[PDB]
Amino acid sequence: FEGEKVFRVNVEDENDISLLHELASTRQIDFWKPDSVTQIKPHSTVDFRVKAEDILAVEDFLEQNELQYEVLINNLRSVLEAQFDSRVRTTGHSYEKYNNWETIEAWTKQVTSENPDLISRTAIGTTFLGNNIYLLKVGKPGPNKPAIFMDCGFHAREWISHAFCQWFVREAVLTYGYESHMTEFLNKLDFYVLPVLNIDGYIYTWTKNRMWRKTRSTNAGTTCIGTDPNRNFDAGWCTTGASTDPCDETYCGSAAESEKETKALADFIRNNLSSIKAYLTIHSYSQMILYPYSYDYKLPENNAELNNLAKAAVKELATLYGTKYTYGPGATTIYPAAGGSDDWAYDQGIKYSFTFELRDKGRYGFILPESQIQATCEETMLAIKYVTNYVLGHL
Ligand SMILES: [Zn+2]
């Protein structure tokens, strides 16, 4: 990644959109925000990574076509080399470092072993490569308990999301019995926490390509690997904002739930639907709380409720470090995109369904340094606990 840059471009009108589409047809562009040229809406900004050999051609294109831009990251190599800046020295698990899959997997076994009265672990299925997909149930044992479901690591490169699910579990077990809200939460409900969904992809970001997003499944008739798991669910599947080309980063897959990982998640949720009252899915970056719908311009029946809940959660998050989040329906932040898990869960009857996009706002983008894990998780905890308390009181 030596000499690679990440650009941000201001798009005003449809002319700017088709210009970016033409640029992306001329050079290989890795869209960071949103996920593809096809998800770009008028009056927004767009972030994308450019290869070293393409920097001058891209800059020339932006300048001569009068697209206003800035360089977010001047040398991606420098940012990548600076990501591992944790002051915690150890080769084992740390909640303040990014942990590889072998380490996270060992952590799921250990944290469960150490806290059997608060945590149980199951494997809800296996990935394309045969890795167990672990799910942790966090709560004091009891009958007929409602549940909140939270997943992290849909997208391989969004490392802060995987880190957050681990932090959440730590907070649940260490504050139970000591902080009144968490104590009430674990007594009355369970959290189902899926710390990494896209395990094969996550491994790939550690071993071969830090910028990988998709699953690692094969596709018929092409060398292009993987499906976008957040375009693989049965929600207006593959009708908008995605791609039928396996070589695209938003490939919807060969069918809804074609991926072992997404099928395992959808099966678990269907099998547990009477219990699950909220669905929370954790991503990065851009500091947003989004709710349905993304697949269509239509609004959910309880739009006013979801908007108010999102507003309150965003305000609660800001109380800690002043971090600013935006919020709203998915289809107001990007061009409509089909096949999302938050939309799917909502259409199953789960009335509280939210996507969280964590820090930052583009300074480091996906490559958030370890030194920000703690503050990111701390403030995010406030929003999650706020949503939990709301859900508990609105059963
Ligand atoms: Zn994501």
Curated annotation (Swiss-Prot):
Alphabetized InterPro entries for the sequence: CPB_M14_CPD, M14A-like_propep, M14A_act_pep, Peptidase_M14
Which cysteine-cysteine pairs are annotated as disulfide bonds in the entry?
152-165, 224-247, 238-252
> Which top-rank group of organisms is this from?
Eukaryota
Q: Which cofactor does it need?
A: Zn(2+)
Which segments cross the bilayer? none
Cellular component per GO? cytoplasmic vesicle; extracellular space
Top enzyme class: hydrolase
A biological process (GO) of this protein is: proteolysis
Keywords in alphabetical order: Carboxypeptidase, Cytoplasmic vesicle, Disulfide bond, Hydrolase, Metal-binding, Metalloprotease, Protease, Secreted, Signal, Zinc, Zymogen
Q: What is its EC number?
A: 3.4.17.2
User: Which molecular-function annotation in GO is an example for this chain?
Assistant: metallocarboxypeptidase activity
Cleaved propeptide residues: 1-89
What reaction is this protein's catalytic activity? Preferential release of a C-terminal lysine or arginine amino acid
Domain Peptidase M14 positions: 97-391
Q: Where in the cell is it found?
A: Secreted; Zymogen granule lumen
Query: Which residues participate in substrate binding?
Result: 155-158, 213, 230-231, 284-285, 335
Question: Does the entry feature the keyword Iron, yes or no?
Answer: no
| Note accompanying the cofactor annotation | Binds 1 zinc ion per subunit.
**Residues at which Zn(2+) binds:** 155, 158, 283
**Entry similarity comment:** Belongs to the peptidase M14 family.
Query: PANTHER family per the record?
Result: CARBOXYPEPTIDASE B, PROTEASE FAMILY M14 CARBOXYPEPTIDASE A,B
- The protein's name in its UniProt record: Carboxypeptidase B
Question: What is the native source organism of this protein?
Answer: Sus scrofa
